[PDB]
PDB file of C-alpha atoms and ligand atoms in Angstrom:
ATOM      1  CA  UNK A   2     -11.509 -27.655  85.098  1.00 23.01           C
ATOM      2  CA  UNK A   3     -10.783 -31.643  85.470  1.00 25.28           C
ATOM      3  CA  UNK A   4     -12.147 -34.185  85.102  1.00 21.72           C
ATOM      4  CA  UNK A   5     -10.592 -36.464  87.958  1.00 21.73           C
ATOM      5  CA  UNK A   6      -7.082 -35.570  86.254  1.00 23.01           C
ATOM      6  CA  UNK A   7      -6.543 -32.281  84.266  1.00 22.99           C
ATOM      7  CA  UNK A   8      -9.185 -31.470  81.413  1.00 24.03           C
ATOM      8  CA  UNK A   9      -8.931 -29.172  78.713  1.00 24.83           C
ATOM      9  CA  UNK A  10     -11.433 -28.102  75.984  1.00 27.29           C
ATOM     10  CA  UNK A  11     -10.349 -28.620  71.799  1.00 27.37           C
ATOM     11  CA  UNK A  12     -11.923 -26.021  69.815  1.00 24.66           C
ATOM     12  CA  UNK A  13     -10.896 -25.149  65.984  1.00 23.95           C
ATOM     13  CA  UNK A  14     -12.934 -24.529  62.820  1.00 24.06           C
ATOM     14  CA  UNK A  15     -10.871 -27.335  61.492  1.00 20.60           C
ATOM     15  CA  UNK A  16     -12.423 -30.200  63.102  1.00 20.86           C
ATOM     16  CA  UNK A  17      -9.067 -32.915  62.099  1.00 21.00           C
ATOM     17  CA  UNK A  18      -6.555 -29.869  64.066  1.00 19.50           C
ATOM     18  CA  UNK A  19      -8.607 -29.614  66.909  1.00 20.98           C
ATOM     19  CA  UNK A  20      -8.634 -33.426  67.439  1.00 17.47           C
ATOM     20  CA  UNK A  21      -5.047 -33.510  66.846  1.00 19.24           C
ATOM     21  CA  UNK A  22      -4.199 -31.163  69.776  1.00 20.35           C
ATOM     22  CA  UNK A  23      -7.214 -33.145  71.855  1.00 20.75           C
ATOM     23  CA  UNK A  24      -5.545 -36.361  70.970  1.00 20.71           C
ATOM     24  CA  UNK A  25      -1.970 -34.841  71.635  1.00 19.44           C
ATOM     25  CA  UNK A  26      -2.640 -33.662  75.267  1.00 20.79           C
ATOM     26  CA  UNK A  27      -4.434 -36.873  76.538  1.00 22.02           C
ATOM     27  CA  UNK A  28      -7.730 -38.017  74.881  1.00 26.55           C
ATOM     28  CA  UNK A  29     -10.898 -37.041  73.754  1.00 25.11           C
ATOM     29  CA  UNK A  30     -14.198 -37.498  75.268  1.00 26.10           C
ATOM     30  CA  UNK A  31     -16.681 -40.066  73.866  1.00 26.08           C
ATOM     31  CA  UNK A  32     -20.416 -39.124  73.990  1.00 24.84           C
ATOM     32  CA  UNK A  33     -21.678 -40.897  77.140  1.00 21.82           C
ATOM     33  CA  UNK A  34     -18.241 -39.351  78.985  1.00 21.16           C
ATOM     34  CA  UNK A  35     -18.962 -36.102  77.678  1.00 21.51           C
ATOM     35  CA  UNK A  36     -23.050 -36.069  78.789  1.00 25.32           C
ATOM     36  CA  UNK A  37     -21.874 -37.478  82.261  1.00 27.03           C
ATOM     37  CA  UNK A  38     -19.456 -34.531  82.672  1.00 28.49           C
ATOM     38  CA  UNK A  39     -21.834 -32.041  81.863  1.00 24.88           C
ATOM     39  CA  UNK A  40     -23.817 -33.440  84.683  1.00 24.22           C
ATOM     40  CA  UNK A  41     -21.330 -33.253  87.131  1.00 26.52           C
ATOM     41  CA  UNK A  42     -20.585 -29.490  85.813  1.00 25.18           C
ATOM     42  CA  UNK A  43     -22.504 -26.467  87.860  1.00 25.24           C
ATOM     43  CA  UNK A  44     -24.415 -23.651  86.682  1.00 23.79           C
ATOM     44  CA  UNK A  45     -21.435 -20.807  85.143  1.00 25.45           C
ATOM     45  CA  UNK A  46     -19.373 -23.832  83.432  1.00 23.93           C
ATOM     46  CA  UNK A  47     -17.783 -23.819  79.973  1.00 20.78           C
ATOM     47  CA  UNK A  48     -19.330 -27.598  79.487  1.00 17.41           C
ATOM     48  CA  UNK A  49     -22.679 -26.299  80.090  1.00 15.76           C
ATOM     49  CA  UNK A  50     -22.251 -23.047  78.040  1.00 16.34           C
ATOM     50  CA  UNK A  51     -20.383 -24.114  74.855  1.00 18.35           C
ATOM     51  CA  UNK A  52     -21.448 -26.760  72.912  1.00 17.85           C
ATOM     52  CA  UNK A  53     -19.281 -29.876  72.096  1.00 18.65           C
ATOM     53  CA  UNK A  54     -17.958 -32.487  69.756  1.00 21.01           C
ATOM     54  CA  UNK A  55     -17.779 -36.242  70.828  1.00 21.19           C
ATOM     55  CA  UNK A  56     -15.642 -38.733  68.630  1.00 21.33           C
ATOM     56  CA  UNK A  57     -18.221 -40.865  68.715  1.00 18.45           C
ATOM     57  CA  UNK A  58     -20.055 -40.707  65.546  1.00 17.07           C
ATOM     58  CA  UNK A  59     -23.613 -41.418  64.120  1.00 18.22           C
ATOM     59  CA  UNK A  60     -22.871 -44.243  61.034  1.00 17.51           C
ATOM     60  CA  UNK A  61     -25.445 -45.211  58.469  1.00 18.11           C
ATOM     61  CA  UNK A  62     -25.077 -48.112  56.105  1.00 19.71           C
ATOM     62  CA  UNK A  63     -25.951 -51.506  55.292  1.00 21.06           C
ATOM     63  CA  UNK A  64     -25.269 -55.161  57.095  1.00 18.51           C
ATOM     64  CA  UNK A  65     -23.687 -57.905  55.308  1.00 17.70           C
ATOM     65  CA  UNK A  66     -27.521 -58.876  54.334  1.00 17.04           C
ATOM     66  CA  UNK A  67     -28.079 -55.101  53.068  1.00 17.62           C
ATOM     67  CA  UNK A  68     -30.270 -54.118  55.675  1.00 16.80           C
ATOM     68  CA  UNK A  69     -29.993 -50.521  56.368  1.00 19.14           C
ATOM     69  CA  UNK A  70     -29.262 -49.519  59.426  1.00 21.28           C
ATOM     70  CA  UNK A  71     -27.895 -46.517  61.678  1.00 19.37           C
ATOM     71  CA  UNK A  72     -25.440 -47.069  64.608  1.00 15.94           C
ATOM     72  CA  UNK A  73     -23.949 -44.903  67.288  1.00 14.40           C
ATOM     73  CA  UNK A  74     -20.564 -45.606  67.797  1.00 17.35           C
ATOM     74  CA  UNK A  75     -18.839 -44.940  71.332  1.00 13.96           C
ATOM     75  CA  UNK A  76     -15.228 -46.333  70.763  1.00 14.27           C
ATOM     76  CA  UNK A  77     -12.233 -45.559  68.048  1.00 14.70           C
ATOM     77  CA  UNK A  78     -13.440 -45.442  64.746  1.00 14.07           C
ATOM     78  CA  UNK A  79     -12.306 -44.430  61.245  1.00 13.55           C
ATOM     79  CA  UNK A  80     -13.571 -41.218  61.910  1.00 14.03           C
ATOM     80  CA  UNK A  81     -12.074 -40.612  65.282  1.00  9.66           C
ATOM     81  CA  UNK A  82      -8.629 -40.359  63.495  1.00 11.76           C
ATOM     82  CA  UNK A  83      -7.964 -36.484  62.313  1.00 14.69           C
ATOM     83  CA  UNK A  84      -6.204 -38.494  59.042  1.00 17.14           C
ATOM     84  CA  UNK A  85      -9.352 -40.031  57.648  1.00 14.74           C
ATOM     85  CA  UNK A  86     -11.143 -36.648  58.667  1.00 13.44           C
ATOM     86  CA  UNK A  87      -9.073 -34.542  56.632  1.00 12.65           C
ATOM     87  CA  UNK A  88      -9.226 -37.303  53.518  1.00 13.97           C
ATOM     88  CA  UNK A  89     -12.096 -39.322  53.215  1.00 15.58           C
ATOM     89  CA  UNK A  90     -14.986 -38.222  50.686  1.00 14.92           C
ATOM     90  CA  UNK A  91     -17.691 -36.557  51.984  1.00 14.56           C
ATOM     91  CA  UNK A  92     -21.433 -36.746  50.916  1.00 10.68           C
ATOM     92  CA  UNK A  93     -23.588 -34.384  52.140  1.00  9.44           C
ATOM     93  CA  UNK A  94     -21.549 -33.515  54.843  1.00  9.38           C
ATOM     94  CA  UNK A  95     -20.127 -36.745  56.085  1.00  8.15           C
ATOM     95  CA  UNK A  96     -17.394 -38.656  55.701  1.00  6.26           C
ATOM     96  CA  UNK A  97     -17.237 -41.917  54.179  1.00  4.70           C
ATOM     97  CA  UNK A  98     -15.916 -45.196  55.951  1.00  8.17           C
ATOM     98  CA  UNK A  99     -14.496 -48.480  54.455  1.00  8.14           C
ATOM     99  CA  UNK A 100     -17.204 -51.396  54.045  1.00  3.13           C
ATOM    100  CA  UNK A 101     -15.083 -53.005  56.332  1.00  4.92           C
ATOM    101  CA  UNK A 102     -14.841 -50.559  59.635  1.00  7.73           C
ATOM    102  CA  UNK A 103     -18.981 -50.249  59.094  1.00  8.35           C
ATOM    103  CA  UNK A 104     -19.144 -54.211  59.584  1.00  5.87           C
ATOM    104  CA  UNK A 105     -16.340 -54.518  62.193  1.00  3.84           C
ATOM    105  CA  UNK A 106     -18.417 -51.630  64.323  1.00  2.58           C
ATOM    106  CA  UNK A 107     -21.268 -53.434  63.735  1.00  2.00           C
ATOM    107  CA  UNK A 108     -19.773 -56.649  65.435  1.00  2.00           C
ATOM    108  CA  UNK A 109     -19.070 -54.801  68.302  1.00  2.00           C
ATOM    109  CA  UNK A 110     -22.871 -53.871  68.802  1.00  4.89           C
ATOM    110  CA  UNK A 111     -23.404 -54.298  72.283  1.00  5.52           C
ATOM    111  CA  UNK A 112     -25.961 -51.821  73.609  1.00 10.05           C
ATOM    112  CA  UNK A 113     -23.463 -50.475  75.738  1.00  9.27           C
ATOM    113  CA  UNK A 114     -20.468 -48.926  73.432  1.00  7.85           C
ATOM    114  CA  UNK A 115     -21.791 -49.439  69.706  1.00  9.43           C
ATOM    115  CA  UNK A 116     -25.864 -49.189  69.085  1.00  6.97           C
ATOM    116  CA  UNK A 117     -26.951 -50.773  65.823  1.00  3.84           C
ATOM    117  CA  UNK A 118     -30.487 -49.885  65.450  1.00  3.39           C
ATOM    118  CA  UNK A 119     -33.189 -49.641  61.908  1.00  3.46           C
ATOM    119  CA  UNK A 120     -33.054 -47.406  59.270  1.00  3.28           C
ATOM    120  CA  UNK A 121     -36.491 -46.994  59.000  1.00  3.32           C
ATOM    121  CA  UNK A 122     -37.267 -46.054  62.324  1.00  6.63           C
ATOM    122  CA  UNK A 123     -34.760 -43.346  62.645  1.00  6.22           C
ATOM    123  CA  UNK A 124     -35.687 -41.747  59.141  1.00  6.10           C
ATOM    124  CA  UNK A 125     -39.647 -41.963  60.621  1.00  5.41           C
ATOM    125  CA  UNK A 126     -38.623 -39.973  63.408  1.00  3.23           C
ATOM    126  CA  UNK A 127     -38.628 -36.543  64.149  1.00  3.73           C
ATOM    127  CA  UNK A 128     -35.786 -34.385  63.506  1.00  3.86           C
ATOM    128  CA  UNK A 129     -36.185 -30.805  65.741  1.00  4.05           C
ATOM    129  CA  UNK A 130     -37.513 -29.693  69.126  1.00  7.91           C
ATOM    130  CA  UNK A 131     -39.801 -31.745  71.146  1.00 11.60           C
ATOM    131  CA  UNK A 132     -40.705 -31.633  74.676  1.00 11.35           C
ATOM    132  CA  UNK A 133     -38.025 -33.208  76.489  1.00 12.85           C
ATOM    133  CA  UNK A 134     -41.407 -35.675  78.374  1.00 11.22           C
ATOM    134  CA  UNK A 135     -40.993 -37.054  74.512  1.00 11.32           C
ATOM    135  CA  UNK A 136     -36.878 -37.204  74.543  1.00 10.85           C
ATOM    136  CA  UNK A 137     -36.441 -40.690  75.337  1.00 10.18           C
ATOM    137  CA  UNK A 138     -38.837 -42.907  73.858  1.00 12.76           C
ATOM    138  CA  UNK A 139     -36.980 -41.442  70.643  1.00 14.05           C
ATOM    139  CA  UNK A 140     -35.111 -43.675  68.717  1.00 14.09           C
ATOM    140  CA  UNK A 141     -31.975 -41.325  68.701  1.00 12.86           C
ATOM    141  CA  UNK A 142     -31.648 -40.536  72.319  1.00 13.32           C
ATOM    142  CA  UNK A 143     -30.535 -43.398  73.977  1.00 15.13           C
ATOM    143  CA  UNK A 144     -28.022 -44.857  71.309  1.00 15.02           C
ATOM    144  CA  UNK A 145     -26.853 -41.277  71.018  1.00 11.91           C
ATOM    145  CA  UNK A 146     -26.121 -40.820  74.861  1.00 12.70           C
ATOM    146  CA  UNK A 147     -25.234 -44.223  75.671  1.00 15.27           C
ATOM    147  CA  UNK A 148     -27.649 -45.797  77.866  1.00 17.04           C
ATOM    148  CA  UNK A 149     -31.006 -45.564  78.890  1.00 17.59           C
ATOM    149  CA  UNK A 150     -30.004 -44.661  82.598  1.00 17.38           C
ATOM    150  CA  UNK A 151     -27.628 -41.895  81.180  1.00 16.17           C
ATOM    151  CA  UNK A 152     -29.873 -41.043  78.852  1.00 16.42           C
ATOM    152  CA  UNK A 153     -32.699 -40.484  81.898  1.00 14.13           C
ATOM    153  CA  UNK A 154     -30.273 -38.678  83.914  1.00 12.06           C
ATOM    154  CA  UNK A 155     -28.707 -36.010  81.065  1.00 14.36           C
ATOM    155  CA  UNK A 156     -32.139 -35.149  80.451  1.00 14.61           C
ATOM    156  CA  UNK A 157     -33.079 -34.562  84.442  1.00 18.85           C
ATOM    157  CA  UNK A 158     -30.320 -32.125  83.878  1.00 20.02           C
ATOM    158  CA  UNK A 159     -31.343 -31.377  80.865  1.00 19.82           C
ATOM    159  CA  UNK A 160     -34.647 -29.826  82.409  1.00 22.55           C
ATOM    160  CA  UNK A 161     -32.644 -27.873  84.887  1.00 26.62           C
ATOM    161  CA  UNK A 162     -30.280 -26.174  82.407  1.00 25.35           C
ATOM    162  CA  UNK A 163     -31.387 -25.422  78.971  1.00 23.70           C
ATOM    163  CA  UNK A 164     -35.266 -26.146  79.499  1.00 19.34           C
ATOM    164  CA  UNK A 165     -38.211 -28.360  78.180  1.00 17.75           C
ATOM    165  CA  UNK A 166     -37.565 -28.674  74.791  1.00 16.92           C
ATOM    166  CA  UNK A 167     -34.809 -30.387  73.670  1.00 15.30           C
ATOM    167  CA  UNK A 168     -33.790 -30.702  69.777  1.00 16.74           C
ATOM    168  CA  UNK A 169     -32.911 -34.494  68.476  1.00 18.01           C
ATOM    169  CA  UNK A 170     -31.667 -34.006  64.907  1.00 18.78           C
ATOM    170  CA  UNK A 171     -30.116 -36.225  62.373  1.00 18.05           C
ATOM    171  CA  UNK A 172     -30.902 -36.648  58.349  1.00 18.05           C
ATOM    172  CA  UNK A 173     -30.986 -39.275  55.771  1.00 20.46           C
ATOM    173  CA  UNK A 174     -27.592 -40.856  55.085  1.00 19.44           C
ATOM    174  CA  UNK A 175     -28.091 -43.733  53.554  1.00 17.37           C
ATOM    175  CA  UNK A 176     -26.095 -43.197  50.379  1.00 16.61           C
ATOM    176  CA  UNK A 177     -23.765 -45.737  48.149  1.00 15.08           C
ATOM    177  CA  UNK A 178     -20.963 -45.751  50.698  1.00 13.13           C
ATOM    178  CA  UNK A 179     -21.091 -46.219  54.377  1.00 15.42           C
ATOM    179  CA  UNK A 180     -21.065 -42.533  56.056  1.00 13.87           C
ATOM    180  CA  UNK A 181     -19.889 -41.105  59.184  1.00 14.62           C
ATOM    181  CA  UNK A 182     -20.580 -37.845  61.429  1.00 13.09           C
ATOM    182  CA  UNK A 183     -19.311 -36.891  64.815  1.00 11.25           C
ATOM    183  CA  UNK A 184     -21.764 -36.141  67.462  1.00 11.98           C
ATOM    184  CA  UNK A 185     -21.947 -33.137  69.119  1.00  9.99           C
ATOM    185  CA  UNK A 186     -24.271 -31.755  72.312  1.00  8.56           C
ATOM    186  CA  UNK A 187     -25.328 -28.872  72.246  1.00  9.70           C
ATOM    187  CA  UNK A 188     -25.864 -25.448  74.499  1.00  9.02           C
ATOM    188  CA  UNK A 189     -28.161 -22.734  75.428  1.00  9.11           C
ATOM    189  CA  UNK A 190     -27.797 -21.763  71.944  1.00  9.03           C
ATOM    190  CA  UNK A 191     -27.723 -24.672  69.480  1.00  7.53           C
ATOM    191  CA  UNK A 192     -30.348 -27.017  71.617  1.00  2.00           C
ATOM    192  CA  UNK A 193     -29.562 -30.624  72.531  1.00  2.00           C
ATOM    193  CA  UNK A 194     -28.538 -34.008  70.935  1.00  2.00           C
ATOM    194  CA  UNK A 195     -27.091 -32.789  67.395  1.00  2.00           C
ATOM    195  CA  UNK A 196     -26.300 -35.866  65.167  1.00  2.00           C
ATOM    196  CA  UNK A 197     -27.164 -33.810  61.606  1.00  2.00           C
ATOM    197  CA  UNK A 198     -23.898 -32.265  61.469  1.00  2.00           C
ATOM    198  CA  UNK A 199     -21.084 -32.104  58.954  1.00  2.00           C
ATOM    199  CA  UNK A 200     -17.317 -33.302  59.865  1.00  2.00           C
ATOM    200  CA  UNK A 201     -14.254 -31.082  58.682  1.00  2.00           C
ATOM    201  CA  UNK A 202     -15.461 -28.281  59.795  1.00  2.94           C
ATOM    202  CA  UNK A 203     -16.182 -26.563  63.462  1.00  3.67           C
ATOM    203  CA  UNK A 204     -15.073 -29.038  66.288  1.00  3.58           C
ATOM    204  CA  UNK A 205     -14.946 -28.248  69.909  1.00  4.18           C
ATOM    205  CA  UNK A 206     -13.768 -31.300  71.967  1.00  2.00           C
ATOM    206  CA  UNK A 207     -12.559 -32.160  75.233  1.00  2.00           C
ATOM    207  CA  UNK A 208      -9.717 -33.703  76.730  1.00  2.00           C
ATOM    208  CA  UNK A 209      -8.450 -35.282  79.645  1.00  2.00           C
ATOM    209  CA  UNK A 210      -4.647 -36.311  80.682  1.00  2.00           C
TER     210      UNK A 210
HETATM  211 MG1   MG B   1     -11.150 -27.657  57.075  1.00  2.00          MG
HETATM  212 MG1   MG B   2     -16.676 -46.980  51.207  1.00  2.00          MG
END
């Protein structure tokens, strides 16, 4: 397995030691990195049968104006540090950020490495399986990959791997501190585009020297 240069896979049930050794071989894998090389993988590969952690995260808080709002984060973050990981308070199963990273990540939304999008319109939307003919007009899927042409091309493969279906989950954290989780895709298993999930605990991620 590589990934143009050598490419390992980071799994613990400690999610800040398996970063560590991902971060102390080369570096992990953001989101739209880690859905591209799944589509370059072939039928029988580990990518395609294990699911995996991104550290890119899924961030819900408030602008400077207090407008709530959720944004998917594809560069280094508080979170992608095993440090703040181990340390920062959790609620509800993620970790909380400094007022100030949330607004500096917000800064930085482009719609290209960062995706600030509304609140509302993520908590309105589903949270499950749903046909994957639904999967992108859903307000998760294309800040979550990375791209609306990524997003249309994971879920070609998508189709051809793990089905019809695919699950787009996240829940409600909009809370009195800014809050964090890491993203993680799943397999044939756990289905799809998994953005519900606490930190601290399982981790599998992958990377490259
Ligand atoms: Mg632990
Ligand atoms: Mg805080």
């Amino acid at each position: 397995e590589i990934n143009r240069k050598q490419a390992k896979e980071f799994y613990n049930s400690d999610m800040a030691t398996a970063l560590e050794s991902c971060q102390k071989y080369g570096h992990a894998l953001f989101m739209p990195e880690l859905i591209d090389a799944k589509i370059l993988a072939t039928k029988g590969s580990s990518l395609l049968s294990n699911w995996l952690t991104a550290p890119s995260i899924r961030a819900t808080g408030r602008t400077k104006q207090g407008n709530p709002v959720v944004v998917y984060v594809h560069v280094d973050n508080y979170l992608s540090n095993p440090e703040n990981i181990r340390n920062a308070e959790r609620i509800n199963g993620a970790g909380v950020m400094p007022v100030d990273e949330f607004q500096r990540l917000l800064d930085l939304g482009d719609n290209k490495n960062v995706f600030v999008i509304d609140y509302d319109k993520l908590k309105s939307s589903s949270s499950g399986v749903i046909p994957v003919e639904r999967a992108l007009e859903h307000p998760q899927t294309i800040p979550f990959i990375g791209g609306e042409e990524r997003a249309q091309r994971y879920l070609e493969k998508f189709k051809q791997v793990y089905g019809n279906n695919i699950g787009i989950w996240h829940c409600d954290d909009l809370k009195d501190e800014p809050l964090g989780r890491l993203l993680f895709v799943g397999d044939y298993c756990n289905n799809g585009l998994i953005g519900n999930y606490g930190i601290g605990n399982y981790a599998r991620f992958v990377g490259v020297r």
